[PDB]
Amino acid sequence: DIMVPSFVYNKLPVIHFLQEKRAEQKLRRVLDETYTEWTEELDQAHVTDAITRSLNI
């Protein structure tokens, strides 16, 4: 009725702070893993060159 409640009450702030920091860490890790994947596509100049070769030019 007295002791354990008081010590739980004393615990609450630090635990709240640590859990907030942990959530922020999770969000930060989520953000840090995001990278844009710039894709490279076959240049159409080679396609045009192959077209010309097929024409026997």
Binding site: Y9, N10, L12, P13, V14, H16, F17
Partner: protein
């Protein structure tokens, strides 16, 4: 404003306690008496210094109510007793 109490402090000054970092600091440099943010926290100097927070009427931008799905957890068990019921 009401006369109701607030988060208990134990007669301690949060600017010098061993867990001071857990208490947010406001602009004036006074750490809060609670994990919440307090703008008007003050310190009084009796034989020992102690922190105080005076409730006041302040408006805060209230985010719209979310759905029950994203904050309710129905993991209750027969032995579980809520803090309100215990009180």
């Amino acid at each position: 404003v009401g006369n109701g109490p607030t988060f208990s402090t134990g007669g301690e000054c949060m600017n010098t306690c061993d867990i001071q970092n857990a208490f947010p600091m406001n602009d004036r440099g006074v750490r809060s008496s609670s994990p919440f943010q307090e703008p008007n926290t003050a310190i009084y100097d009796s034989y020992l210094a102690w922190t105080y927070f005076q409730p006041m009427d302040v408006h805060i931008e209230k985010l719209p109510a979310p759905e029950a799905k994203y904050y309710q957890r129905h993991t209750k068990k027969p032995w579980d007793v809520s803090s309100t019921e215990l009180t």
